[PDB]
Assembly symmetry: D2
Homo-oligomer: 242 residues x 4
């Protein structure tokens, strides 16, 4: 959609499914070098790369479960290894990984949800940073970091989803620091916060995944979101006002 996205190294966690996939398509279709990601190789990974390669862009697939740090380190290495550097990081990887009411919340479930949603976004962002900071000085422009938020990061988790809500709230926050201490390194930080009961949505609809994806492109584009950093954008249909 945006011209300057042409020829850009874009790393996208959780891009094999849903929103992460939806965006990936748009990034290649703007002529960008996308990195796909998942816990395990999806059946038709190569036929997917064929679509994106044809759209004007280029792609690759690096499997990794980011709940662990070493995995975050390698995912970064292997993407760098193919395209040689990074301009955009899209921390889409995450999820409920279940529902549990408070009394049922134990160490096992807690850690499954915490590391899935937070440690992933942190450690990855850490390993991607000095590469992102490079891309920015190189171009004299600005690299970009985007993470996937939620309405729950404002209002709190749904039924049994307490940790998921607060984990996204954690991310909304931790970016504000990263803006304070790494704006000087030429890296922007921003969040797309998708909003999914139908009576409390003025629109009535739920949100699709191609309803979400453009915000990401907007937030990665220096031309478009040059002076915007440290913001959350809720694509929810009016379920929450932010």
């Amino acid at each position: 959609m945006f011209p300057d996205l042409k020829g850009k190294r874009v790393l996208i966690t959780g891009s094999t499914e849903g929103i992460g996939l939806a965006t990936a398509r748009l990034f290649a279709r703007a002529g960008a070098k996308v990195g796909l990601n998942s816990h395990v190789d999806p059946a038709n990974i190569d036929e997917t790369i064929a679509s994106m390669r044809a759209d004007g862009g280029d792609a690759a697939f690096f499997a990794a479960d980011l709940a662990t740090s070493e995995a975050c380190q390698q995912l970064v290495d292997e993407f760098v290894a193919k395209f040689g550097g990074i301009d955009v990081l899209i921390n889409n990887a995450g999820g409920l990984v279940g529902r549990k009411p408070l009394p049922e919340i134990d160490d096992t479930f807690y850690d499954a949800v915490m590391d899935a949603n937070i440690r992933s976004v942190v450690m990855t962002t850490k390993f991607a940073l000095p590469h992102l900071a490079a891309a920015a000085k190189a171009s004299g422009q600005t690299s970009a970091v985007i993470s996937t938020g939620s309405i729950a990061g404002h209002t709190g988790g749904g039924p049994g989803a307490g940790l998921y809500g607060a984990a996204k709230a954690f991310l909304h926050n931790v970016h504000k620091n990263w803006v304070d201490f790494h704006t000087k390194d030429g890296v922007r930080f921003n969040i797309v916060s998708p909003g999914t009961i139908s009576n409390g949505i003025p629109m009535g609809r739920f949100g699709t995944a191609e309803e979400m994806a453009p915000a990401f492109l907007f937030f990665a584009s220096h031309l478009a979101s040059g002076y915007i950093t440290g913001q959350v954008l809720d694509i929810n249909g009016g379920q929450y006002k932010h």
Copy 2:
């Protein structure tokens, strides 16, 4: 820059200099018909219109002060007369209108700051709504309203700027009420919220993580993004702060 804005009819208030202008010129480059607006025309106007028609869209100036509901009405009637409808509304009109600390606020001041920033926005939107809605029925898509906010609408205004800050805060809130009862009517409401914009100038540029104010040019793309049903079709009720990290909503 966005495709589906070709031939969309766009009214933009206070739109003949700074942000409002930079926004319009770019709205020209998408091929959209735009309503330029000011209290009074500048000499520039014909050039502006020209360059805007050169870039592949269309322009047309309408004079109006929005401190008075009647101007807010007739302004819509004129625009709509010319282009036979509205697809996007941009409430940019507003301003500090001086800087008085609390003690020094009189009624002519209070009215001036309020009428400039709130009354305008409110009434203009009111008159527009049934037209906006109209186009939205036609398209089967969505017309869009976009109001220019401010950082002060979150942090409170600067020296003698209290009423500006609060007036913007007002807009942030009232948009939410409008999201409730007029999403039905097919109109999306959103807010671009600029930070401070171009010894006192220096001291504040220090704190902003990007070590400066924004150029009018950096506030523009957001509006289009908000205008583009393609881009922002399922986004209404939001605020987008373009401030170099000055505040993080």
Copy 3:
């Protein structure tokens, strides 16, 4: 409730009814010199003053409709005239003054709602300021300003109440300035924001007026809210999280 409230000049707009009344009772009952207010003299004003005079405090009644500036100026003068100064201002005066959908919103209704809720809180606060600033230097402590907010100041007006919501949002904001530019004068600013559909309140109940009133006392007390200024406190039962 708080010891230091004993012997304090407290001005309370809209104190003849509901919450403003509820609080007034508590202020006198802590030994304070309260100023009551209304648009027009209420029938049993003097029997009310009898209750408060008996509780350990003292009171008076100054009628005024604060939609106009000159009225705000006199209300301030006449209270000062009786007790000689001000330590606490409680901008409770306000209200919907109707419901109107957007298309029906005209100059007459607009101004009725705007001046009732904003100009009142502004001009009054203006005229009270230098007297409040005096009380603070005198005691070396801090005077206090409190205003009545709403859930609507966060979420937006109810049906036809667009302006009421945004007007309270206006107040939430304008205090943040007053904190910036008059903390030096020894004056604190804070807001009690009462929250009144029963399915979206976790508690189930609506709020009473003696459920609200203590927050005010807490916010006026230097002993209790010495270091707190520029905050909003929602007494809503969990309808909105702030």
Copy 4:
């Protein structure tokens, strides 16, 4: 200071110095039984207990690190064993636990900051809940949980403090989930959020409208206020920032 806190049973974590302490001592002066807590007891402890029993309430120390769910459990069992219930829970335990910029964060650090501030709060509340609820059935009133937040939970943390800021932000949010599904259980959840607390010390005191940090003593009354069903019975889900105007939530 508040009446209806006479004989209420109150657990307070990290409550043997600074804010947590100043809070407890005042909780003594209301005539409430309090659970003092630390990793390890200081020598002070007996004096503290004494002065707290002198002031007309009661004390009792329990050692525990809350980085581990088991300690969070047994700590509740001990307290509840001694005083046969809970009426108020105060999750104060937490801290910076060092200051590392992003690159320098390792897992032993990340775990340390997370376990200290989030895991604790979560689990402790979990174990407490059924007891808190219990007392609430008895009273026909409300037990109360109160978690110590921070300014960084809104503004993001300071140098090397990113994880502290975010952990507090986590608490702000999770309390809302708990308000939904456990108001039923008669427990109110709220947050006192201190700003920074007592050349680097100087430079930040500049911006705070009250030209300083808060004393532990100024953060204390809020907690009681939140504890007192009398005072705060219809308040749950809120945050109270005691920061001299540093941030205005």
